[PDB]
Amino acid sequence: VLTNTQATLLPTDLQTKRTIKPGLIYTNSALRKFVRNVNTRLNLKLLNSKQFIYSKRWKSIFSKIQPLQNGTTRKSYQLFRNVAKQILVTPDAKSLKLITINQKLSLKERKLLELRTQYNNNTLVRP
Amino acid sequence: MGASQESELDFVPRLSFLPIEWRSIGSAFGLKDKSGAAANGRATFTVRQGVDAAELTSTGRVIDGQADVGASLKLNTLAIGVSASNITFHSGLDDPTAAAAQRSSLIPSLKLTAAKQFKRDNYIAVSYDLKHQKPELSACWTGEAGADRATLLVNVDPVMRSVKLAAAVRTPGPEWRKVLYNDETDLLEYPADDGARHTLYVQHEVRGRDLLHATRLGCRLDLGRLVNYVVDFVDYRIEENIPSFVWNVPLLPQLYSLLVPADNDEQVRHRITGWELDVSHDFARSGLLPVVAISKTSKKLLGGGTLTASYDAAAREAGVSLSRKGVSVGARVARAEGAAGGLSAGWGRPSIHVAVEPLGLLQ
Amino acid sequence: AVKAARPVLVGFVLHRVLKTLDRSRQLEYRLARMGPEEAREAYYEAVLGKDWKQQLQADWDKA
């Protein structure tokens, strides 16, 4: 016995050939094992077969201010740029101007943020 | 809006590089209905003042008209097509150049073709010309992947053992815009599309045992995308590496402000649109000299009219062309070979050509 | 530099044609070009095989 809200979550036309003891814990255990088995089969089948995010606010801020309009702000920019290129920039980063506006996101965080953007814009056992 | 029923195999406006029978097959399979018949055509007209090849004197006017005609009809999935290509109409008197062009022209030919759409946007055909009675086979694969689109065409003839390939890609090319992150709404912001694209095409013809007998290549670039990409690269990767004393010379930071402006929300620095650059070059023709054209697709001039200015260094010719929807009025001028020594290379020979598709005139 | 840069350009255009044409025929664009219900079966035809109903029934019976 499983409720109507569960019955529209799993894919339909499944036949039950056995009688399960009454109670909620047995129903939820069977559904949980079913989700586990389907994900295992999907990953086995998938294994048997054959992106820099930037910040809007910081980019707008650093584009808003200008050096080079006079010697004073130019010299301030030169001094900061010398010291920052010495100690702040790491070798695999390619530019100081590029990483001052880079949003420093990890790989899983940017994948989940792409997925949530795709959800807000518009599998088998995920719900 | 205003999306016309263009050829799914042709890519380039105002330029054709396909056989007319395959354009007829692509137009027949481009029908919205599941059955019907389609027709297509091309024509070009050359008008000039005739210059004699012997004494360099003006004799008269030479008008020539060349025509391509295609017709097809479609069953449940197949198409049958009859085409009449390369029919030349000649007017003029006492011209060895007209006779030499008549001997070395594309011959007026009639063609049957039985085409089968064997997969969706994947076609195969067997054609057989009737006047010269020669059979040949052909295949075509077109594809769309989001932003970009590709087309490959193969023609194989065992009589002359001729192998022709045509290939084209329409793609947005290099991208400079950033994928932003909105700090407030916790969502990404992707750059919007422009609609403008770069086109790359190649033609490769083998006639006989010459394994590289002919090869032509062409590249068509949106200028605004290239200028904005270059300005973005200079502003983000080069400007921090300029030495300091460079800015102390007069007027140079202000000049850098005019050439490279500040960044904004839509992430374009220079608002350039409608300008486009064509570089086309063939290898079988001698000298390795390019054909370079600049084009403006202005919307306000006669409804999307394109004004084109072109140069070829092999024929030393310049061209001014007005084009709209397959109509093309092109006046080209030829720099003749000058006299033996000193200030004698002047501009003569204006020549007006008209390209038309009369079934494209109904739009 | 004709003999060095000519087949590089030719092979670049031909390789871009081939790797756009091959990259236009896989799962996601085809599923984008069909309606939603037949997309729901075609997803299962791709990721689970042909008899996906029998496979889900075996997973349910094992549960």
Side-chain angles (χ1 to χ4, degrees):
Chain A
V1 191
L2 60 85
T3 187
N4 207 347
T5 77
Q6 293 155 344
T8 73
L9 286 165
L10 75 165
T12 79
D13 65 271
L14 284 178
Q15 263 75 36
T16 81
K17 302 168 169 58
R18 200 193 280 270
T19 300
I20 293 300
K21 286 178 183 190
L24 182 135
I25 54 159
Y26 301 104
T27 311
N28 272 357
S29 176
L31 292 163
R32 199 183 303 121
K33 289 175 190 295
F34 175 69
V35 160
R36 204 169 291 127
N37 296 345
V38 171
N39 273 332
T40 302
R41 195 186 294 269
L42 279 165
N43 284 269
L44 182 63
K45 182 64 194 301
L46 197 65
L47 203 58
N48 272 333
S49 88
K50 207 46 178 289
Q51 284 73 240
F52 280 166
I53 320 289
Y54 295 86
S55 186
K56 175 165 79 173
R57 183 177 292 171
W58 301 341
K59 183 178 173 289
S60 59
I61 283 300
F62 277 113
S63 69
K64 193 189 287 190
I65 57 171
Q66 294 82 17
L68 279 75
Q69 67 258 12
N70 44 3
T72 78
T73 45
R74 205 149 65 234
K75 195 177 67 169
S76 299
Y77 184 47
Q78 289 310 121
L79 289 175
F80 178 75
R81 208 168 80 238
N82 281 330
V83 181
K85 283 186 168 67
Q86 207 79 17
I87 62 178
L88 285 181
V89 190
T90 177
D92 55 349
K94 65 179 72 66
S95 168
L96 172 78
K97 277 204 61 49
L98 269 179
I99 61 174
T100 186
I101 63 157
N102 194 349
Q103 185 91 36
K104 281 99 164 161
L105 293 157
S106 165
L107 172 77
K108 283 216 171 186
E109 313 194 292
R110 71 154 60 102
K111 279 172 173 169
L112 292 157
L113 184 61
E114 282 157 2
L115 259 61
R116 288 170 67 258
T117 303
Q118 193 205 101
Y119 278 17
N120 198 276
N121 193 11
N122 290 308
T123 70
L124 274 79
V125 288
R126 178 187 292 167
Chain B
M1 292 176 70
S4 60
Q5 185 178 2
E6 275 201 342
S7 172
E8 292 170 343
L9 318 190
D10 201 1
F11 271 42
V12 188
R14 316 165 271 99
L15 271 171
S16 79
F17 78 111
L18 306 170
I20 193 66
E21 55 160 16
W22 268 102
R23 293 179 66 188
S24 287
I25 297 169
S27 66
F29 291 164
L31 285 168
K32 293 179 182 181
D33 297 332
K34 283 204 176 183
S35 288
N40 198 348
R42 272 183 292 181
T44 174
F45 291 86
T46 64
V47 186
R48 52 179 149 84
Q49 178 85 347
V51 192
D52 210 348
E55 302 191 351
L56 301 165
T57 55
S58 301
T59 55
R61 301 174 182 184
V62 183
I63 316 180
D64 314 313
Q66 287 70 240
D68 291 331
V69 161
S72 280
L73 61 95
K74 180 182 183 292
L75 270 296
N76 47 331
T77 188
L78 60 90
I80 193 66
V82 176
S83 178
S85 82
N86 315 328
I87 297 89
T88 54
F89 189 33
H90 279 276
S91 296
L93 283 153
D94 303 332
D95 201 47
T97 78
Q102 276 180 177
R103 266 212 167 181
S104 73
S105 69
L106 281 154
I107 297 169
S109 181
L110 278 80
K111 288 180 177 64
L112 286 171
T113 315
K116 181 63 70 177
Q117 181 192 3
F118 72 97
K119 300 294 187 291
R120 190 199 167 171
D121 302 329
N122 307 119
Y123 319 106
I124 191 166
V126 176
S127 67
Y128 164 56
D129 80 336
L130 188 143
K131 195 179 87 74
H132 309 269
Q133 53 207 320
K134 308 301 193 285
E136 66 264 3
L137 282 73
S138 293
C140 176
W141 297 277
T142 69
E144 275 262 10
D148 60 359
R149 183 189 158 84
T151 286
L152 189 152
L153 191 152
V154 170
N155 197 354
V156 177
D157 180 84
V159 175
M160 294 298 102
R161 313 177 189 184
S162 83
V163 178
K164 166 177 312 206
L165 281 72
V169 161
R170 199 161 187 82
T171 178
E175 193 72 31
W176 72 99
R177 311 213 211 183
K178 322 290 199 302
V179 174
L180 300 186
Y181 162 75
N182 206 336
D183 311 76
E184 296 181 357
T185 74
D186 203 70
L187 291 173
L188 297 189
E189 287 190 354
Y190 292 88
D193 203 3
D194 277 340
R197 268 139 179 84
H198 309 286
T199 304
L200 296 171
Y201 64 94
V202 62
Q203 293 142 74
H204 171 271
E205 170 165 359
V206 168
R207 277 203 92 262
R209 291 179 180 169
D210 196 1
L211 296 177
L212 207 61
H213 195 58
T215 299
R216 176 143 45 91
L217 188 153
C219 181
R220 305 193 74 279
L221 308 156
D222 191 17
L223 270 188
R225 291 193 69 82
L226 186 65
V227 174
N228 293 315
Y229 182 78
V230 161
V231 159
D232 178 77
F233 193 89
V234 165
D235 189 78
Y236 272 56
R237 314 257 307 261
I238 292 188
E239 190 276 331
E240 58 186 7
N241 297 115
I242 293 179
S244 296
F245 76 103
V246 170
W247 304 118
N248 290 318
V249 307
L251 307 185
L252 197 59
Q254 321 195 0
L255 189 150
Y256 188 79
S257 84
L258 276 71
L259 277 71
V260 183
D263 187 74
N264 63 6
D265 295 333
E266 68 273 15
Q267 313 179 51
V268 293
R269 268 85 179 271
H270 284 297
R271 196 157 268 99
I272 285 157
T273 184
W275 291 88
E276 184 178 1
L277 204 74
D278 209 332
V279 177
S280 77
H281 53 96
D282 58 356
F283 301 143
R285 197 261 308 150
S286 66
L288 196 67
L289 281 174
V291 176
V292 171
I294 190 167
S295 307
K296 178 165 184 60
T297 316
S298 64
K299 189 50 206 61
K300 295 179 285 185
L301 193 143
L302 280 183
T306 290
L307 180 59
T308 314
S310 70
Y311 193 90
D312 170 74
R316 308 180 77 186
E317 61 86 20
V320 176
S321 298
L322 279 75
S323 183
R324 200 259 321 279
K325 212 182 284 292
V327 181
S328 165
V329 184
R332 68 180 65 251
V333 65
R335 166 81 72 92
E337 284 166 319
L343 294 153
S344 51
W347 286 337
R349 313 174 177 174
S351 304
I352 297 89
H353 323 308
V354 172
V356 74
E357 318 160 0
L359 299 175
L361 280 175
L362 304 189
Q363 283 182 347
Chain C
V2 177
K3 300 196 154 174
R6 182 255 303 268
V8 162
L9 290 163
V10 166
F12 179 50
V13 185
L14 183 63
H15 178 269
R16 190 63 191 267
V17 165
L18 273 171
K19 300 294 187 291
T20 300
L21 188 153
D22 189 359
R23 186 266 183 275
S24 159
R25 59 88 174 173
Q26 63 288 339
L27 176 61
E28 69 271 20
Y29 293 98
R30 175 176 56 243
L31 273 294
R33 263 177 308 261
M34 71 200 53
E37 180 70 29
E38 63 265 29
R40 286 274 312 176
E41 293 85 4
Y43 196 68
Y44 296 156
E45 300 294 328
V47 303
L48 260 178
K50 182 62 65 68
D51 48 342
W52 54 270
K53 294 171 76 177
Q54 215 285 328
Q55 268 172 108
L56 301 178
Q57 177 64 46
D59 295 333
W60 179 251
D61 282 346
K62 201 206 302 172

